[PDB]
Amino acid sequence: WDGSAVKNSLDDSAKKVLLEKYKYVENFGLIDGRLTICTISCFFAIVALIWDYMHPFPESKPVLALCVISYFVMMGILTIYTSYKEKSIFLVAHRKDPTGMDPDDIWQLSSSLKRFDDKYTLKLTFISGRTKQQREAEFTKSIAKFFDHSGTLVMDAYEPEISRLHDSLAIERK
Amino acid sequence: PAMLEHLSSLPTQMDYKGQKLAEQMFQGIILFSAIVGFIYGYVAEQFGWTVYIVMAGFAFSCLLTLPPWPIYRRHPLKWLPVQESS
Amino acid sequence: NTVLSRANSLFAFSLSVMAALTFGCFITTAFKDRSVPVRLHVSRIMLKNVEDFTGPRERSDLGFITFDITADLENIFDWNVKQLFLYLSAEYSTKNNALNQVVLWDKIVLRGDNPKLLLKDMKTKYFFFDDGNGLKGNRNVTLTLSWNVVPNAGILPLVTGSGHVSVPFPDTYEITKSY
Amino acid sequence: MNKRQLYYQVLNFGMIVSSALMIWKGLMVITGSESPIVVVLSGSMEPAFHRGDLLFLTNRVEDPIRVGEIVVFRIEGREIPIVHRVLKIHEKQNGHIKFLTKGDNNAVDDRGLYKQGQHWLEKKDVVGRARGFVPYIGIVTILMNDYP
Ligand SMILES: *[C@@H]1O[C@H](CO)[C@@H](O[C@@H]2O[C@H](CO)[C@@H](O[C@@H]3O[C@H](CO[C@H]4O[C@H](CO)[C@@H](O)[C@H](O)[C@@H]4O)[C@@H](O)[C@H](O[C@H]4O[C@H](CO)[C@@H](O)[C@H](O)[C@@H]4O)[C@@H]3O)[C@H](O)[C@H]2NC(C)=O)[C@H](O)[C@H]1NC(C)=O
Question: On the Lumenal side, which residues (chain D)?
């Protein structure tokens, strides 16, 4: 019923047509940073829990207070980290055989759909290292006109956007 | 193909701004019942009247929430632009 | 099936009305920070039979307390108060640096039972127990009325009303003849 | 390996259980002594204090004990936190506190702690002092605790 179903299904279809047509290697690492912060948080949480289970409380007050204040400010910087880096950008892919060339011309892509509104937005940008400059393409559309409750979310009705994408990539990479 | 359109085939096939104004009316009648509740608790000077007004407002919200609104279901495209058929 | 929309709506409105009632209840208990005291007036005092109870448990001292009360509660009733409670602060000192206190009585007062609280010569069935029998030789005992209430969902303060009665005590005399 | 499902599983599971347990620990720290937030279950207090109430807890941060106050403490014969009312105080200004205690609506003391010659409450046999109570969530949490 919510929009998140068609959001992540269209994101999975976009990654599928990306890997099926453009042949670029997807990567990550902000997810690895989330692994880092969650594993470190669970590390000192379980250490504090075992240390409070094995030892009485009034000799264990002050450094436990320091640990929970450290966790509170760590969750605060995690919240502003999320709100400053992970708004809607969901995938990053790198190219194949950079023989003698610097690892540049890399694209980020994001899908924007606000709270209960019929305005889908597809924003994809790329850093081109020829002039060290970013170019962003934007789509302000809606997809739910033609198909019905059966869910015809097929490539055979959405291919002109991918056609615009690959011939724009052709005229931008010459 | 058709092996993934089974469970993820239900978005909201309804209006948007109609439910926007509807939820505006829901929050409006909730805040109206709340403000008349605490001013009648300030006037009548006992808490059971405030309890009765809050429970009556919750019952009115349930009686305005549970109904299907069949006309809205019949015409989601009454305000939304008309979708096409596959 | 299609009742998941109604399920999400009932979660949303249930948390909405729960948040609304919680905001209402701590805004309700927020603005009543000030409290008002009560008044105490005791006409006379009667003090009898302060005896040295040589018992098998300890060799302590026993005594009886009898007095009168006149008070008023027409300026103590609030909007969220539920129960009115009594306790008697009867503080004195002994020779072994022991500051003792014995409570006397209490009443389960509900709002609407008694508009005027005044009655004479009551008898408290609670045993006035001396700890280390040093009351025989004391020169003053004092009394001050206090009270306690409960709100609907708030905090528990104690507000002691102003007013104290100071009564002396003779040196060595068993069955005390008081007027 | 299992990247995404284990990722979101450890994310939401560790977030919920760690956050809940350590805000509980933060309340434990901020209440001075150990002092968990408790629920009432007494039956002799019902004309004075009803059944199924949450109770917070303050402690000895720069304040001595007074009279006319609820006091919660251990029952070591059953190892149960039980609250009563204070009725007697007996102190000396050198570091030992021994006094009597007795609940409401009863002519019976709080038996089971010590013998008849000794005072009932020592200064180390105490949990603290509850400032606040919530009168609606307690019935819900005791019906949750009574459910297998
Ligand atoms: C009756 O017996 C007492 C002691 O046996 C004699 O001493 C005076 O008692 C009065 C009260 O009855 C005292 O007044 C109050 O004193 C409080 C602190 O004193 C305590 O500690 C001393 C230590 O020796 C005890 O003697 C004393 O009884 C108390 O236990 C103050 O905290 C009080 O202040 C309150 O009121 C003010 C407003 O006035 C508020 O601002 C405060 O916050 C607080 O609420 C109060 O001052 C008095 O201090 C005692 N001493 C003297 C020298 O007077 C009495 O003399 C005796 N009376 C008779 C007639 O025999």
Answer: 25-148
